[PDB]
Each structure stands twice: as structure tokens, then as C-alpha cells.
């Protein structure tokens, strides 16, 4: 479930001296709002989507060499230039070797030689500069009824409305924060994890890179960082790559800042500070008859991780949509004790199970739910 | 070809005041020995094989995780221990999550959870301590005839003999050197290249390692260096590797000392200082008649990279195995000028081509090869 049973959930209650109550919404946390005559709402931040990030530079971390050619000459015959020297998709190397009889040349001496190989990247990571203003926050408002409404907000339109399903409307004004010095900070993505590193530290990485505005994927820059030519023997210099740089990147990003994922969705850390105005909220119910008084416990008392207690029951009896007779009594039945979180428990159908939550006082307490013809008298010992 | 036309070739001549001449044999270099009445020999170091190296430790650089299991519990139900915790081939992780209704548990609160995954290494490098005394050096001695004898030496048996094919025998005494502080130095092998690194720097590498005496390949030590558990959500913590560490190793070994290969054979740098005693060497020939005097130039004059000049000719004429009339004359035919490198050029067969090498003086010189009935009078301009 949500909110109830979430270790990171804060309660808040609007005073009777006005409205405009402040809440703090963060990812993985729920906020519970309530007041007298006002319905209880649950606010939760779902995802923080940073749409339209600007690709800054693309580095290659795993490449492969194919189409390796080699051409040699004899002493006093000129250098052996290859056509692949005029191709940015290739990397070449010149050298000189000893030439004479046993290798089939004119005379003795230093003969030139050239070896080229096609550079083709296989796996490559990316880096993007992210804009702070065009961020998007998804918030879910749920009426705490026990039987959600989404809203997208952005720093360029912090004011919004919320047409709840039969509960009225509530006004929101949020102000955000999500990091540190975003303009000169780059989100690095390895197509498996994500980090937030410095701009200068990212721009000067010793790897074959391509500019942001690029779709070629073959005219890289500084390919020699992943390509080394071995010592030439008879002819071919035996060019060789340097394997994969995935582990080097995973190890070099230790002192960075990683961002988890929810299968695609980036979990951006940060908190929204929001003002809520609930003066235009109505309670779904009120004008309802009382139920006949038969209730069967689907499952009885169970305290949450925030002092509040919850019971799930079913109406079963017939009496239309009606209000649940619910009272919190002493060890006897003197006065009413704890308050109610799920304000005005209603019933949509006799077969639909309904949960209810409330905060009891210390020690022994009674819960009277249902009229006498089938009254549920559930005792418990809080704390 | 060899020796002739090798840019790293040194000449040496034994004086008439005894024998025991010193030479320096290194990989990729040839030594030319000669003297009056003594045949010319070519010494070359082929391979430096360090047989029987002692494996010290085996590190893994590319692993993969399979057989991932996960088990959870409810609050006040105990921790969920898995059977894979008692298996060194697995890596596990404990955690606690929020549990209540929507995830099917008893009540609310912190419920334990455990996730394990089988650690299986795919590609792994090795490190070996190498012994200096049990080194093996392969030397090739070739009689400079123009138409080789191998010997294996070790520091534990530096004295040897050389039964040349019809030239007598020569005595050798070599003393070696090949590096720096071998006892606390480890040869690192990645099954593609080889380095020589420090012992302490190698023993403390942050990678899953196994002791030297090991054939298991699955009960590694410190596997968590290549395994990280992501944040748990509903149940599985989503364990993930760190890719491949091949690039990290290839980059970290920059300030080391690399060793090239000749397809399997390690090219150990170093020089052997050898004493040669050639007093028991005879010249294959001497008691031979002179040829009739017909020679056709297979290919004429061509100077090497060490001042010496070479011509390849064929006998063609009939006259049994005979000695070649060969003289170096002035611009006229006054006196004999340059000496001869291929001492006493013989002939095995009239159809077998034969090379000849000699050093001429400055400027113009004549080469008289063959008796007058078909005499070859080849002029050239050295320097
Ligand atoms: C590389 O070699 C393959 C196989 O011969 C060939 O199909 C391909 O066209 C070559 N590419 C280049 C750029 O030469
Ligand atoms: C891992 O899973 C495969 C596929 O189910 C199975 O064949 C293998 O026996 C499993 N290994 C272990 C150690 O559980």
C-alpha cells in the first residue's frame, strides 16, 4: 500500500486561523493533510522527469578494429601511402624496417611501411547538460477514503488546480530544488546507471569523443587512445585495441553522485516546498443516512509505523451508501477519545471492502463500529 | 635474410695474440666473428624462454552473475536466510523494507530481505614470479658460407660445445643479464600482452583474486569489488556487475615495463656476454681444385647497411666442388685491396646459387671473379 505503512510519511493539520499550509514533497515520501470538516488527502511525488536534455559530448568505451591493411616499400622507393589515410574512420601508423634479399626488395636498408585499421565503436556512453527550469514534477493527490489524481508541475507554472473526484478543489504553489550548480554540471549516462559529474572533469576525459550535434558515430576524435600499434616484424605492425573501458568508468565515478532508476525513470533527489489552500474542499458524504449496523471484520486491528491504527471491514448488510457509525471509547464508554484520520467513512457498495484509520490514545481503548444489531466492539492496547 | 642487412649487427675479429674473444648477444642482433685461416661465423639469440614460472595469484577481470535468488519476510517473523549464503561461489546482501497490506504480509513495519547471486568469472589474467637461474637462451651459430646450429644455454651450465657441420668446433662461455630485482618482481600476463610489475603493487590490486595453488576458479576472495547491489524496491535488490576491468588494467600498466611477443615466445630484454674460443675451427675446403672460370651473375653488386658488399652468382659450368677465384683489385690490377668476409667461397653444386660478401676500400674498386675463359670483371664505386 501507500502512505500508510511508509516509514517516510509526515502528518500535517491546518489550523483554524486560515489556510495556506506548507508541505515538503520528496521522492519516496508521502504527506498527509487533514483538518476539521476538511477531507484528508495524501500527496506523493512520483517521478522527476528532466525532459529534453542537451547532449554535450559522446565518448566511446568499447570499440573494435576491422579492415586492417598494410603496405611496404623498398629502400629508395618512397613511402607507401594508403588510401585509408584520408578516412577519419581509420587510424594509420608509419614505420621503417630492414629490407634486403630474404624479404624480396631491390637492395639493403631502411624501407618504409604503413599499416591502417578501421576504427568502429561498439558501445558508447553519453553526457548531457540538463536545464533546471524545464524540469517536470509528477504529483499524485489521493483522497484518503480507503476504497489517484495526477498533476504535472514546472517552475515556469508553479500555480495549478486539482479537481478531485467529488471532494472539491485544492490550490497548490510549489517551489523546487534538486541539486547543485546545474549549468556547469553534466549528467553522465552509461545506458545502465547515471551520475552527475563536473563539466570540466567530464570534458577532458581521455577517450575517443564526438561533439554533441552528431549522428555519424564513425569520425571520432583521438582514436589512438583505444588503439596501439605493436612492434612490426615482417610486415604487419599488428594493431590492437585496449579492450573495454566500462570498468574504468565505473571505478572512476566513485567520488561522484549516482542516481537510481525505476526502470527508465530517473530518481532525481530534491524536495518541493508547496503551499496548499484547502478552503475550497468539500467532504464526499455528509448528507447520508446511517448504516443498519452489521459489519464483518475482513481483518482486524493493525498499527502502522506512525502511531495510527487501521482495520479493514466489509459492509455485507444492506442499507445503500451510508455513513459508518464509528466511535473511540474509553475502557468503559464515558467520553470519546482518539480522533479519526479517514474522516467520515462512507460506503460505495455493500460488497466493496473498506479500510479505516485512526489514532487512539495511550493504553486501552475501545472501537465501537456498527449499530447494536451486529455491533463490533473491538478493544486494543496502543503503546 | 639474416645478419647481412640487419641494422643491429656488430663485427669482431680475433687477434693473432691468442683467442678468447668477447661478444655481446642480444635479441634482434647478430654478431659476426672472423679471423685469418678461421671461418666466419654468425651468432644470433633467437628466444629467451623462461620455462616453469611460479603462479603467485590469479585475478579476475571479467565476471558474470547468474542464479539470482531473493527471499523476504514480514515484520516480527525473523530474517530470511538463504542456502546460498553458505556457498563461496555466491555473494549475498541483507536489507530491510516496508511491509504491510499491499505487499501481502501480517502487519506493518520493517521486514527483512536477502538477495544472493552466483559469482562466475569469465576472463581472468595471471601473475607469476619468475626464477632467474632456470632461464634458457637459444643461440644459433651459422657458418657464413652463403648457401643453422642451435644451442641451449642456462646460467647453471654456461660452458658448452658446438659441433659445426664440417668446420670443427668452437667453445663458448656466456654470462647473462635480463632485468632488475627479479625476486620481488611479477610477470603479469593478460593472455595477449605481458608486463613486469612490482610485487607489492601487484599483490594489493582491488580485484577478486585466488591464491597461486588453485584450480577451482569459483571460490574467489573479495567478490564485492565486481558486484554491487542496487536499491531494493518491491523485493529483488537488482544486483549488477561492474563490466570488464580489461581497460582499467591496460591503462594502469602505463608506467610499467611491457614485453613484446613473437606469437607465444616472450621477448625478454637483456644481453649475454660470451667468450668464444675458435682455436679448434677448421675451414671447410682448402684442399680443393680451382674452378674452370665460368660464372653468371644471378644478381650483381649491392651494399649492406654495414659497409660490406654482396653479390649472388651461380656456377653453371662444370668442375666439381671447387674454390672460387675471387680477387679485389685497384682501378687497374696492381695489388689486392679489400679483404673477404665469406672466407674461401666454395661450391656444393653447379646449380646451387651462392652469395659472397666482402668489404672494399674507398672509391673505385674491381672484382675479378672467375678464370679468364668467362671471367667476371665487376667494377664498383664504394662510398
Ligand atoms: C571490410 O572488409 C569486409 C570483408 O571483406 C568488406 O565487406 C567491407 O566492405 C570492408 N570495408 C571497408 C571499409 O573496406
Ligand atoms: C542456475 O540456473 C540454471 C537454469 O535454471 C540451472 O540449470 C543451474 O543448475 C542453476 N545453478 C545453481 C547453482 O543453482
Amino acid at each position: 500500500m501507500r502512505c500508510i505503512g511508509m516509514s517516510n510519511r509526515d502528518f500535517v493539520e491546518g489550523v483554524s486561523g486560515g489556510s495556506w499550509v506548507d508541505i515538503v514533497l520528496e521522492h519516496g515520501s508521502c504527506v498527509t493533510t487533514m483538518a476539521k470538516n476538511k477531507p484528508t488527502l495524501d500527496f506523493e511525488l512520483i517521478k522527476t522527469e528532466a525532459k529534453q536534455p542537451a547532449t554535450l559530448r559522446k565518448y566511446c568505451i568499447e570499440a573494435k578494429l576491422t579492415n586492417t591493411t598494410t603496405e611496404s616499400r623498398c629502400p629508395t622507393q618512397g613511402e607507401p601511402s594508403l588510401n585509408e589515410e584520408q578516412d577519419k574512420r581509420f587510424v594509420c601508423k608509419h614505420s621503417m624496417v630492414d629490407r634486403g634479399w630474404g624479404n624480396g626488395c631491390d637492395l639493403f636498408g631502411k624501407g618504409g611501411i604503413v599499416t591502417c585499421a578501421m576504427f568502429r565503436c561498439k558501445k558508447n556512453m553519453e553526457g548531457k547538460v540538463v536545464q533546471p527550469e524545464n524540469l517536470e514534477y509528477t504529483i499524485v493527490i489521493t483522497p484518503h477514503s480507503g476504497e489517484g489524481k495526477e498533476i504535472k508541475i514546472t517552475p515556469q507554472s508553479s500555480i495549478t488546480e486539482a479537481e478531485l473526484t467529488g471532494y472539491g478543489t485544492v490550490t497548490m504553489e510549489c517551489s523546487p530544488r534538486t541539486g547543485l550548480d546545474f549549468n556547469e554540471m553534466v549528467l553522465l549516462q552509461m545506458e545502465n546507471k547515471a551520475w552527475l559529474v563536473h563539466r570540466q572533469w567530464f570534458l577532458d576525459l581521455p577517450l575517443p569523443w564526438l561533439p554533441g550535434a552528431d549522428t555519424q558515430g564513425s569520425n571520432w576524435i583521438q582514436k589512438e587512445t583505444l588503439v596501439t600499434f605493436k612492434n612490426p616484424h615482417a610486415k604487419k605492425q599488428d594493431v590492437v585495441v585496449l579492450g573495454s573501458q566500462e570498468g574504468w568508468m565505473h571505478r572512476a565515478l566513485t567520488g561522484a553522485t549516482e542516481i537510481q532508476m525505476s526502470s527508465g525513470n530517473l530518481l532525481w533527489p530534491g524536495h518541493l516546498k508547496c503551499r496548499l489552500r484547502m478552503d475550497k474542499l468539500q467532504l464526499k458524504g455528509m448528507s447520508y443516512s446511517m448504516c443498519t449496523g452489521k459489519f464483518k471484520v475482513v481483518k482486524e486491528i493493525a498499527e502502522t509505523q506512525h502511531g495510527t491504527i487501521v482495520i479493514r471491514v466489509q459492509y455485507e448488510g444492506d442499507g445503500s451508501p451510508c455513513k459508518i457509525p464509528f466511535e473511540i471509547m474509553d475502557l468503559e464508554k464515558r467520553h470519546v477519545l482518539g480522533r479519526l484520520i479517514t474522516v467520515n467513512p462512507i460506503v460505495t457498495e455493500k460488497d466493496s471492502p473498506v479500510n479505516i484509520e485512526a489514532e487512539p490514545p495511550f493504553g486501552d481503548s475501545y472501537i465501537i463500529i456498527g449499530v447494536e444489531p451486529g455491533q463490533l466492539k473491538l478493544n486494543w492496547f496502543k503503546k
Side-chain angles (χ1 to χ4, degrees), chain A:
Chain A
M1 60 304 158
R2 263 71 197 280
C3 296
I4 54 139
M6 289 193 60
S7 302
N8 294 81
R9 183 261 285 263
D10 297 4
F11 290 92
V12 68
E13 186 168 350
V15 299
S16 58
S19 302
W20 45 95
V21 56
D22 286 0
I23 65 171
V24 181
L25 273 171
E26 44 177 336
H27 202 300
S29 177
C30 166
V31 181
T32 301
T33 67
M34 54 175 295
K36 51 183 178 180
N37 294 20
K38 317 297 176 56
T40 300
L41 302 182
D42 285 350
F43 296 79
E44 187 176 13
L45 182 67
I46 301 300
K47 60 177 181 59
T48 306
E49 191 173 13
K51 229 177 184 62
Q52 313 296 337
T55 299
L56 181 58
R57 185 171 293 178
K58 194 170 188 176
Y59 290 87
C60 178
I61 53 99
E62 189 184 33
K64 186 174 73 278
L65 294 176
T66 52
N67 300 97
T68 300
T69 56
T70 306
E71 180 176 324
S72 181
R73 282 295 202 274
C74 300
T76 70
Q77 236 189 19
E79 309 161 308
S81 60
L82 286 172
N83 301 122
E84 288 72 20
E85 302 178 5
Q86 318 302 327
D87 196 335
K88 274 67 184 177
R89 303 168 293 184
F90 284 76
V91 52
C92 297
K93 188 65 179 302
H94 287 230
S95 178
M96 283 186 174
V97 290
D98 301 354
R99 303 300 299 269
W101 290 93
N103 39 35
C105 257
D106 309 353
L107 310 97
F108 296 75
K110 285 299 195 304
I113 195 161
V114 170
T115 304
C116 300
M118 172 184 177
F119 182 86
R120 198 65 211 93
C121 183
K122 305 182 65 177
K123 188 178 181 179
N124 37 72
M125 41 146 289
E126 281 194 359
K128 301 172 183 177
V129 51
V130 52
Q131 65 287 60
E133 279 69 28
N134 302 334
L135 268 162
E136 190 184 39
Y137 301 86
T138 303
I139 311 177
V140 159
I141 315 173
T142 299
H144 195 91
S145 59
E147 59 183 353
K149 173 70 64 175
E150 286 198 6
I151 174 62
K152 309 287 186 177
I153 62 111
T154 170
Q156 291 175 318
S157 76
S158 54
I159 179 63
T160 180
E161 67 102 29
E163 257 282 357
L164 286 176
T165 310
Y167 294 82
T169 180
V170 53
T171 309
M172 305 192 61
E173 286 198 276
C174 296
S175 195
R177 59 243 319 280
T178 180
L180 244 321
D181 328 293
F182 262 56
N183 57 333
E184 294 181 351
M185 215 69 68
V186 183
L187 168 69
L188 192 151
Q189 291 164 302
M190 302 255 299
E191 282 291 338
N192 54 84
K193 299 168 185 176
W195 291 266
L196 185 62
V197 295
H198 294 74
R199 189 184 184 95
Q200 282 301 325
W201 179 93
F202 171 80
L203 288 179
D204 56 7
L205 291 182
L207 282 180
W209 60 271
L210 279 163
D214 165 73
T215 331
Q216 204 84 15
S218 58
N219 296 324
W220 299 82
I221 286 85
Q222 298 189 30
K223 296 169 289 297
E224 301 85 20
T225 54
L226 294 186
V227 160
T228 168
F229 300 89
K230 222 167 66 66
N231 288 338
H233 290 99
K235 54 275 170 187
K236 297 186 177 182
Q237 306 187 59
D238 303 0
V239 65
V240 56
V241 297
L242 280 310
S244 181
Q245 314 304 305
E246 182 179 359
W248 182 75
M249 291 301 300
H250 279 172
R251 186 179 297 269
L253 296 170
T254 299
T257 303
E258 197 180 14
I259 293 89
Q260 261 63 26
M261 306 182 312
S262 181
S263 184
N265 304 268
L266 292 177
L267 275 62
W268 287 77
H271 326 278
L272 301 157
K273 298 183 179 181
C274 303
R275 298 176 47 201
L276 285 172
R277 316 214 299 110
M278 307 168 62
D279 45 67
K280 274 182 294 185
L281 280 181
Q282 62 187 16
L283 218 175
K284 176 192 175 186
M286 289 300 187
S287 61
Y288 263 148
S289 178
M290 304 302 299
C291 300
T292 57
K294 270 204 170 186
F295 299 98
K296 175 167 163 293
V297 277
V298 172
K299 201 54 175 296
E300 214 189 330
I301 192 63
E303 189 179 17
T304 66
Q305 306 168 67
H306 301 275
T308 62
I309 69 185
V310 178
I311 301 181
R312 174 143 63 96
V313 295
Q314 192 182 27
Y315 191 16
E316 179 174 342
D318 295 6
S320 298
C322 49
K323 292 163 56 183
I324 307 305
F326 184 84
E327 299 196 44
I328 305 300
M329 290 288 192
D330 293 294
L331 287 76
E332 49 277 358
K333 292 184 69 176
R334 244 63 154 189
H335 315 286
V336 187
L337 288 187
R339 218 195 305 104
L340 182 57
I341 303 299
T342 311
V343 289
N344 186 24
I346 60 180
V347 158
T348 302
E349 291 156 327
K350 57 156 175 54
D351 295 324
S352 179
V354 180
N355 298 261
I356 186 171
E357 179 190 27
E359 45 176 352
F362 283 164
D364 302 317
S365 299
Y366 258 116
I367 293 180
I368 305 296
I369 161 177
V371 202
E372 273 298 332
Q375 175 174 119
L376 296 186
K377 192 181 190 65
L378 306 175
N379 69 322
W380 212 41
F381 176 72
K382 180 261 183 179
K383 181 262 169 300

